[PDB]
Ligand binder design. Structure first.
Ligand SMILES: CC(=O)N[C@H]1[C@H]([C@H](O)[C@H](O)CO)C[C@@H](C(=O)O)C[C@@H]1O
Length: 379
C-alpha cells in the first residue's frame, strides 16, 4: 500500500569514480535517509531526492543528495547520487535539505533541485552569524532535462545576490517543493539566517527566476518562525506555510515579497506541537477553484518523535481544515523524523497525488490519489 524509496541500512551508492561509498549502516550501507523532496513530470515519472546521511542521522555529518526515479507509479525505484558533497571533511562535508521544482522553463521540462552545502562547520547553520555570508556555506542548484535520468550543476547568481544583500549569513530552500507560477516564474521558498546585527535571527522569503540561471530576492522579508516553509499561488498572492513550534504560520504577499500579512485560511490551523516540523503545502484545482493539501506531523508525544504524519485539506475560501489521512500513523525515530513532501499532477485525464515521508531512517512513498475527491470537495 506503500513502497520503500530508500531503505535505511539497505542501500549502497557509488562515488564519482565509481567506488562504493562505505557508510555506517550494517554491511557498509548508507546509515540513514532524511528530508525527502518529490517532483513528478509530465511523463508520470516520479523523482524523489533525499539526504543520504551515510554515517549518522545528524545534520552535522557526511551527506550526499540521493535521487530515486520511478517510471512505474512508485512500485520500483532506480537510485543514484544526484549531488555529491565536496569531500573536504570525511565527517562533516555535506549537501543537504533538498527543495525541488518541476517546471517548463521556456518550454523545456526541467527538474530543479537546490541544496545547502557545508564542509567544515561542526555546528548547526543558525550558529554562524558573523559573516555576510558564511564562508563555509553555499547554496547549489542542479537541473535535469532528460526526465530525471541525469542531473548537472546550474551556474547561478544565488551566492552573489546573497552577498550583495549584505544582511544574510546563509540561505536554504524551504524544504520539499517550490513552484512554477501560472505566468511561468520559478519560485523557491527560502529560509535565511541573518547576520548577527539583525535583530530577527531568521526570516522567510523566496527567490525567483525566469530562466533558472539568474535569480532575484524580493526587498522584504517574512517573519522566520521555524523557517522551513512552502509557497502556493492564490490569485495575485503568494502564500507561505511555515514551520513553527506549536501552530503553523501562514502569511500572504500581494506585492511580490515586499510585505507579508497573515493569511487567515491557513494561519494557525495545524498544530505540530513541540519544536515544530517541516510540512509540505501545495494546491490542487477543483474546477476553477483551488484547495490546499498539506502534510505534517500530529506529534502525539510532543517531542522529536513527530508521530502521525498526516494529510490535511485547507479550504482557502472558508478557512475550514480537516484531516484526510494519517498516512504514517507511527511514532518516528527522534534521531530525525516527521518530514514529508506532496506531489500533485493532472497528466492527460489522470490526476495523481503522491507523498513521500520519513519512516525510521527510510523514505517511503504512498499513492494518495484515492483521497482526491475528498480534497477537491473542500471548497
Ligand atoms: C541545515 C539544517 O540544519 N537543517 C535541519 C533543520 C535545522 O537544524 C533547524 O531548522 C534549525 O535551523 C532541522 C531539522 C529537524 O528539525 O529535523 C533537520 C534539518 O536537516
Amino acid at each position: 500500500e506503500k513502497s520503500v524509496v530508500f531503505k535505511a541500512e539497505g542501500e549502497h551508492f557509488t562515488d564519482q569514480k565509481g567506488n562504493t561509498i562505505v557508510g555506517s549502516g550494517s554491511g557498509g550501507t548508507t546509515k540513514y535517509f532524511r528530508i525527502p523532496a518529490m517532483c513528478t513530470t509530465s511523463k508520470g515519472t516520479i523523482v524523489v531526492f533525499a539526504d543520504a546521511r551515510h554515517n549518522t542521522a545528524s545534520d552535522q555529518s557526511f551527506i550526499d543528495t540521493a535521487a530515486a526515479r520511478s517510471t512505474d507509479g512508485g512500485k520500483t525505484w532506480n537510485k543514484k547520487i544526484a549531488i555529491y558533497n565536496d569531500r573536504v571533511n570525511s565527517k562533516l562535508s555535506r549537501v543537504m535539505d533538498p527543495t525541488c521544482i518541476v517546471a517548463n522553463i521556456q518550454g523545456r521540462e526541467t527538474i530543479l533541485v537546490m541544496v545547502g552545502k557545508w564542509n567544515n562547520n561542526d555546528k548547526t547553520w543558525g550558529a554562524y552569524r558573523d559573516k555576510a555570508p558564511d564562508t563555509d556555506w553555499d547554496l547549489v542548484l542542479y537541473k535535469s532535462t532528460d526526465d530525471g535520468v541525469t542531473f548537472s550543476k546550474v551556474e547561478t547568481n544565488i551566492h552573489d545576490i546573497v552577498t550583495k544583500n549584505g544582511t544574510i549569513s546563509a540561505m536554504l530552500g524551504g524544504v520539499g517543493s517550490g513552484l512554477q507560477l501560472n505566468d511561468g516564474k520559478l519560485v523557491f521558498p527560502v529560509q535565511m539566517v541573518r547576520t548577527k546585527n539583525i535583530t530577527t535571527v531568521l526570516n522567510t522569503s523566496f527567490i525567483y527566476s525566469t530562466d533558472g540561471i539568474t535569480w532575484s530576492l524580493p526587498s522584504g522579508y517574512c517573519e522566520g518562525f521555524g523557517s522551513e516553509n512552502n509557497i502556493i499561488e492564490f490569485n495575485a498572492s503568494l502564500v507561505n506555510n511555515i514551520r513553527n513550534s506549536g501552530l503553523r504560520r501562514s502569511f500572504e504577499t500581494k506585492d511580490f515579497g515586499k510585505t507579508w500579512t497573515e493569511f487567515p485560511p491557513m494561519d494557525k490551523k495545524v498544530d505540530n506541537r513541540n519544536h515544530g516540523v517541516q510540512g509540505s503545502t501545495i494546491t490542487i484545482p477543483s474546477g476553477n477553484k483551488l484547495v490546499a493539501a498539506h502534510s505534517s506531523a500530529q506529534n502525539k508525544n510532543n517531542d522529536y518523535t513527530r508521530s502521525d504524519i498526516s494529510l490535511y485539506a485547507h479550504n482557502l475560501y472558508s478557512g475550514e481544515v480537516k484531516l484526510i489521512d494519517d498516512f504514517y500513523p507511527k511514532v518516528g525515530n527522534a534521531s530525525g523524523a516527521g518530514y514529508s513532501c506532496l506531489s500533485y499532477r493532472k497528466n492527460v485525464d489522470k490526476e495523481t497525488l503522491y507523498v513521500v515521508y520519513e519512516a525510521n531512517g527510510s523514505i517511503e512513498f504512498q499513492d494518495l490519489s484515492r483521497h482526491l475527491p475528498v480534497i477537491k470537495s473542500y471548497n
